[PDB]
Amino acid sequence: ALQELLGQWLKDGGPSSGRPPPS
């Protein structure tokens, strides 16, 4: 769930992507 989105989330600078972690 959150693991799959993590890579997408990380692609935008993870935590610094303007949004909290998928977890």
Side-chain angles (χ1 to χ4, degrees):
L2 71 103
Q3 203 278 110
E4 282 287 275
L5 201 157
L6 230 291
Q8 201 70 86
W9 180 56
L10 209 143
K11 237 196 80 151
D12 205 78
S16 298
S17 68
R19 45 180 84 161
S23 49

